[PDB]
Design an enzyme around this catalytic site. Structure first.
Site, PDB file in Angstrom:
ATOM      1  N   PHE A 289     -12.370  25.029 -18.950  1.00 19.64           N
ATOM      2  CA  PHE A 289     -11.711  25.106 -20.240  1.00 19.64           C
ATOM      3  C   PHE A 289     -11.718  23.685 -20.777  1.00 19.64           C
ATOM      4  O   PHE A 289     -10.826  22.900 -20.480  1.00 19.64           O
ATOM      5  CB  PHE A 289     -10.281  25.620 -20.110  1.00 19.64           C
ATOM      6  CG  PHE A 289     -10.158  27.040 -19.636  1.00 19.64           C
ATOM      7  CD1 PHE A 289     -10.342  27.371 -18.296  1.00 19.64           C
ATOM      8  CD2 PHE A 289      -9.809  28.042 -20.527  1.00 19.64           C
ATOM      9  CE1 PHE A 289     -10.193  28.690 -17.862  1.00 19.64           C
ATOM     10  CE2 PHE A 289      -9.647  29.356 -20.098  1.00 19.64           C
ATOM     11  CZ  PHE A 289      -9.838  29.681 -18.768  1.00 19.64           C
ATOM     12  N   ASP A 290     -12.730  23.338 -21.572  1.00 21.11           N
ATOM     13  CA  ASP A 290     -12.813  21.950 -22.019  1.00 21.11           C
ATOM     14  C   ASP A 290     -11.579  21.552 -22.825  1.00 21.11           C
ATOM     15  O   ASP A 290     -11.075  20.429 -22.688  1.00 21.11           O
ATOM     16  CB  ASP A 290     -14.109  21.725 -22.805  1.00 21.11           C
ATOM     17  CG  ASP A 290     -15.326  21.716 -21.903  1.00 21.11           C
ATOM     18  OD1 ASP A 290     -15.273  21.023 -20.862  1.00 21.11           O
ATOM     19  OD2 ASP A 290     -16.324  22.387 -22.221  1.00 21.11           O
ATOM     20  N   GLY A 372     -18.428  15.342 -19.635  1.00 23.63           N
ATOM     21  CA  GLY A 372     -19.420  15.433 -18.588  1.00 23.63           C
ATOM     22  C   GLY A 372     -20.814  15.629 -19.147  1.00 23.63           C
ATOM     23  O   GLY A 372     -21.312  14.764 -19.870  1.00 23.63           O
ATOM     24  N   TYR A 374     -21.856  18.125 -21.139  1.00 21.61           N
ATOM     25  CA  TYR A 374     -21.913  18.783 -22.429  1.00 21.61           C
ATOM     26  C   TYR A 374     -21.359  17.910 -23.548  1.00 21.61           C
ATOM     27  O   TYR A 374     -20.444  17.094 -23.438  1.00 21.61           O
ATOM     28  CB  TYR A 374     -21.195  20.151 -22.447  1.00 21.61           C
ATOM     29  CG  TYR A 374     -22.163  21.225 -22.083  1.00 21.61           C
ATOM     30  CD1 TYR A 374     -21.912  22.180 -21.079  1.00 21.61           C
ATOM     31  CD2 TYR A 374     -23.376  21.282 -22.771  1.00 21.61           C
ATOM     32  CE1 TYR A 374     -22.866  23.179 -20.772  1.00 21.61           C
ATOM     33  CE2 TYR A 374     -24.347  22.258 -22.492  1.00 21.61           C
ATOM     34  CZ  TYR A 374     -24.067  23.213 -21.486  1.00 21.61           C
ATOM     35  OH  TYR A 374     -25.000  24.191 -21.199  1.00 21.61           O
TER      36      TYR A 374
HETATM   37  O1  LIG Z   1     -16.928  20.098 -19.039  1.00 23.97           O
HETATM   38  C1  LIG Z   1     -15.978  19.939 -18.011  1.00 23.97           C
HETATM   39  C2  LIG Z   1     -16.647  20.080 -16.643  1.00 23.97           C
HETATM   40  C3  LIG Z   1     -17.280  18.757 -16.211  1.00 23.97           C
HETATM   41  C4  LIG Z   1     -16.525  17.595 -16.177  1.00 23.97           C
HETATM   42  C5  LIG Z   1     -17.105  16.398 -15.784  1.00 23.97           C
HETATM   43  C6  LIG Z   1     -18.436  16.366 -15.407  1.00 23.97           C
HETATM   44  C7  LIG Z   1     -19.189  17.528 -15.442  1.00 23.97           C
HETATM   45  C8  LIG Z   1     -18.616  18.725 -15.843  1.00 23.97           C
HETATM   46 CU   LIG Z   2     -25.007  26.431 -22.717  1.00 22.90          CU
END
Ligand SMILES: O=CCc1ccccc1
Ligand SMILES: [Cu+2]
Ligand SMILES: O=CCc1ccccc1
Ligand SMILES: [Cu+2]
Ligand code: NA
Ligand code: NA
Ligand code: NA
Ligand code: NA
EC number: 1.4.3.21
Lengths: 620, 620
Positions: A289-290, A372, A374
């Site tokens: 859940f961003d 991260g 995304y």
């Molecule tokens: O988007 C949150 C998951 C995430 C956080 C930090 C690095 C990679 C993936």
């Molecule tokens: Cu995607």
């Protein structure tokens, strides 16, 4: 003087001091969330009271607290100790991002797993991933992060090109214990690099693109007063910023001749979730859940002129609070500008001989965040004709895995040995409606096909039906593209000149909702994502579709609990919650960095005005 | 030297002379359609032969002819007399637009109907409306137009504000007979004017809009050679123009390193239809095929710089043939330009420290047409990342009626006494596919939900299924938004570097298809509009989804007849026919001139490239 003004550095500093004097901000404390509260219903008293809500973490293991502070009066209004096994853990701290990797680097099971793969620990990055709630009884009431590993061959290498599959670890970040290390088997670490700035991969850059110059020689058509109040082409609104939600729009209104007419009281993206569809134990727990777990506003980018925002740009630089209560500025974190938007209206008439063309334009309010791998752009658009639109732009690097020998039903292949698990990106828009005031209702509108017969002798007739949603228990709705389903938010006490209630129509993109099995953990924790539209009665404390504390909450918080009250929503102060998302089967073209894909929704006037509202637009 | 070049004035003049010398272009003849034919499959002989297809009308009542001419050799290739009761009437002539009004002005029943309403005949405009095929046996084999009346109070008045309801007339335009005048009763003629340039209605024009300047100081990034061949940012194509279809795109290809890779052989909007949903006898016959019956290309507008097309614009001015075989130029009828299109790709990486932003842009090819009250913009877009998109923009003035006392289930009220009948705007895109060559196939792709259980213990898995369409009889498909349905066109004999067939994915908007009862006349004549996707085997003479002669054809021509051949389409030369449309319940804001609404579709690469195709885009 406006209560909706952005938080200032001075306000943040006062909160920190208020907390400190009250003894709530000791050395083992961390601020996990700090945000300004909206004024309560009935702000027409002119009594300014700026209140802030604070989530306070304790790194020594004591219970966290939720605190509400008045910066105007310099007082703590309330302070509650939280039982996190009950109501959920606090959002992930940015300072915890590195703790997962550092704790694993000294764990003998983790080192044994890396040694079997001939991986040097100094080159292994570990993503700090939210844990969810699954079968591990020992995690209840503990602050857990899970870690997946990626290899960086050198400091500027894209680690996403080199996932270490078959390995996952769980970490208690408060007690600094590695609770489990699971190794399901050795997968080759994919060898090709994904360095999209390496000339070896890009080839020679194009020399064919000539410049496009966008300028406003007399400046922009909008004005900004009081730091964040916008007026543009009859629109009026305030641009807020919250560390959890990001850009929030307040008091969206339209000046119709003499009268300022409200449309939306508050618009935000109140949650977003990325569920993964790979049944491998290494990743089948993965749903982040961003917004609710990581707070998308604190990772907003500084946007650079000419690159991120093109044209005559006005910036806002919001201020947020760090883990210690110090202010810092997100410089150039919000871009605002107007854009030409093609033809607005056009007609050449065969009988009058009049030729008529008008151009459209839109006001853009946007920010970009990075969590991260995304990156997401959030775009709000206001158009001349009264249309409001939201667009999310998804880019960044896809989350990777190994691609198994012999294939996968749940993972796409991107490069030799490199996979990308299927997943969705699902958003929740929270629209606190105020169509001509607060007395609103929602109608569901379906196309109606008619049978050829008496009264329809040629079989050409078709029509529409509208169903008023009167109680919360019947206001959980699904899309139906085949019947052209839309929802109209109207004000039954405000009529246009034809004596019809004024309204706005919500047009969805009708993308699939949450695909997970209804009995799954993620369906319980992201219940909002299983339905396209929810309507609730407004309440001060019903802010997020997933509840206040999303991290490791066991489920059912937020919207399913709200609507169980079964409140009257027929001509009342209501909130529309719209779920919309992208279902992503990654393609080769998404690698090694993904071209933007988009999703969103729009609202159009539906008898809100007494005729077209853009008859007074001049001829350029 | 290219066979796909636009028709020139000299070519048109030769056709006229060839016809005249052969005795096919006498004084009672009218050219209803003239267009250049595409080269047949196997054009690799370099033997130039420019052929034109001509529909010749006879105003003395003789049978029309279809003629094919070689302008290169100066010969008539074939000339066929048409039995219009069998195969349909020829398209409406522009010179017939006024004939309906003038014939009615001297008919005693028409004058008696106007006199009862105290309407002066000199002020009554009559729309020349296509007739369709209904219950009137006397119309079979006759050239019929139907007329609906509108009052102009003065020469610059918008007649659409003043419909004369309860009155319709039918006219044989060849014999100059009024066959029927139907008067169902007196409705008040709505009195308010709809003059959107009248300061009384517009109010004072806005002074708030500041200019937006779009310039390309080094010129555009695309080149035009041979009159109509475009190269832009690795794309290559030819821009055609046909009087029936409008802008047609040929030979869409993408330069992938060393190789020019075909994508689409020919793309066009091959039909469009506007069915009305009002069961009143005055309008229940109303369904106009702007493409097949009226020919949208002959009514293309001259587009003015700064107003219709903004930026650094390159124009094409196509040439067409009038009723007598004379050439005339549609000056500035096609606009071409590139547009900034926001962010292309963006990532800021927490581990490499690299910040990366690239901007997108699109190439725009567009024209605007006006057919009576309606105006449509047709837009083709090419994007940097390989996406192809089409957008139709609908504006103009809505077709009006009276609004009945006590309301209507099939008409919206726009102003006191003024109604707008419900209707749809449905388009057919014809895409002659050539994904990496002509050996193509179509797969239907659905999301697959999975049940929680063994192999999916956490209930998070989801997947996709693809079904190859192998024969025409199974290639008539419907949308399913709920399951995320798309269609992939792939080349099974051309693999990417992961040994997967290259492909493109068609993304539909999933709007409702034709709403009429399946037994209706319009469902038979516009059968294409009842389904979202059709796939046929390529054949030279299968050009339009509705057949060659749409006007007063009794039904079943075009796509239902083609697919009955049940040809092999699995790895063959195929054509995709995509139906898409808007369902229009008019709103107050659509009056007195409608703000643009849009619909369209797009195709995205799906493993066509071996990685992102925009890694070589420079950093602005
Ligand atoms: O988007 C949150 C998951 C995430 C956080 C930090 C690095 C990679 C993936
Ligand atoms: Cu995607
Ligand atoms: O769009 C074709 C139908 C039509 C033609 C001319 C005037 C009004 C309406
Ligand atoms: Cu319409
Ligand atoms: Na719990
Ligand atoms: Na509300
Ligand atoms: Na027939
Ligand atoms: Na083909």
């Amino acid at each position: 003087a406006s209560p909706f003004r952005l938080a200032s550095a001075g306000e943040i500093s006062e909160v920190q001091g208020i907390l400190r004097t009250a003894g709530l901000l000791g050395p083992e404390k961390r601020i996990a969330y700090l945000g300004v509260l909206d004024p309560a219903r009935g702000a027409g008293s002119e009594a300014e009271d700026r209140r802030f809500r604070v989530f306070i973490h304790d790194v020594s293991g004591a219970r966290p607290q939720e605190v509400t502070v008045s910066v105007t009066n310099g007082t703590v209004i309330s302070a509650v100790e939280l039982d996190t096994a009950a109501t959920g853990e606090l959002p992930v701290l940015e300072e915890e991002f590195e703790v997962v990797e550092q704790l694993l680097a000294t764990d003998e099971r983790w080192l044994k797993a890396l040694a079997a793969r001939n991986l040097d620990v100094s080159k292994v990055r570990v993503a700090p991933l939210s844990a969810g709630v699954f079968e591990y009884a020992e995690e209840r009431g503990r602050r857990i992060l899970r870690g997946l590993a990626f290899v960086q061959d050198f400091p500027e290498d894209s680690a996403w090109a080199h996932p270490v599959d078959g390995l996952v670890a769980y970490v208690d970040v408060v007690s600094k214990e590695v609770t489990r290390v699971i190794d399901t088997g050795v997968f080759p670490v994919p060898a090709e690099h994904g360095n999209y700035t390496d000339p070896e991969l890009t080839g020679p850059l194009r020399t064919t693109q000539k410049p496009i110059s966008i300028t406003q020689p007399e400046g922009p058509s909008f004005t900004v007063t009081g730091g964040n109040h916008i007026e543009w082409e009859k629109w009026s609104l305030d641009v807020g910023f919250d560390v959890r939600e990001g850009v929030v729009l307040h008091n969206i209104a339209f000046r119709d001749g003499d009268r300022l007419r409200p449309i939306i009281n508050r618009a935000s993206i109140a949650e977003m979730v990325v569920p993964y569809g790979d049944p491998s134990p290494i990743r089948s727990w993965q749903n982040y859940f961003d917004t609710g777990e990581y707070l998308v506003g604190q990772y907003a980018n500084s946007l650079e002129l000419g690159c991120d925002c093109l044209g005559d740009i006005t910036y806002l630089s919001p201020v947020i609070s760090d883990a210690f209560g110090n202010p810092r500025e997100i410089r150039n974190g919000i871009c605002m500008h107007e854009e030409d938007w093609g033809i607005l209206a056009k007609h050449s008439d065969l009988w009058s001989g009049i030729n008529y063309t008008r151009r459209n334009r839109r006001m853009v309010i946007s920010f970009f965040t990075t969590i991260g791998n995304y990156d997401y752009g959030f775009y709000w658009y206001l158009y001349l004709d009264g249309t409001i639109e939201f667009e999310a732009k998804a880019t960044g690097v896809v989350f990777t895995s190994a691609f198994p020998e012999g294939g996968s039903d749940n993972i796409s292949q991107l490069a030799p040995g490199l996979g990308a698990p299927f997943h969705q990106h699902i958003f929740s828009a929270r629209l606190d409606m105020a169509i001509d005031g607060f007395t609103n209702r929602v109608e569901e509108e379906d196309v109606v096909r008619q049978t050829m017969g008496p009264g329809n002798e040629r079989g050409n007739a078709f029509s529409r039906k509208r169903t008023v949603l009167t109680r919360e228990s019947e206001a959980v709705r699904e899309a139906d593209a085949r019947t052209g389903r839309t929802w109209i938010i109207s004000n039954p006490e405000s009529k246009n000149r034809l004596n019809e209630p004024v309204g706005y129509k919500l047009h969805a993109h009708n993308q699939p909702t949450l695909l997970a099995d209804p009995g799954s953990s993620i369906a319980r924790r992201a219940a909002f994502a299983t339905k396209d539209l929810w309507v609730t009665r407004y309440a001060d404390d019903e802010r997020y579709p997933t509840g206040d504390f999303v991290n490791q909450h066991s489920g059912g918080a937020g919207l399913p609990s709200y609507i169980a009250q079964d409140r009257d929503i027929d001509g009342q102060d209501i909130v529309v919650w719209h779920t919309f998302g992208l279902t992503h089967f990654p393609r080769v073209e998404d690698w090694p960095i993904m071209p933007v894909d988009t999703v969103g929704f729009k609202l159009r006037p539906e008898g809100f005005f007494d005729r077209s509202p853009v008859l007074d637009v001049p001829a350029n």
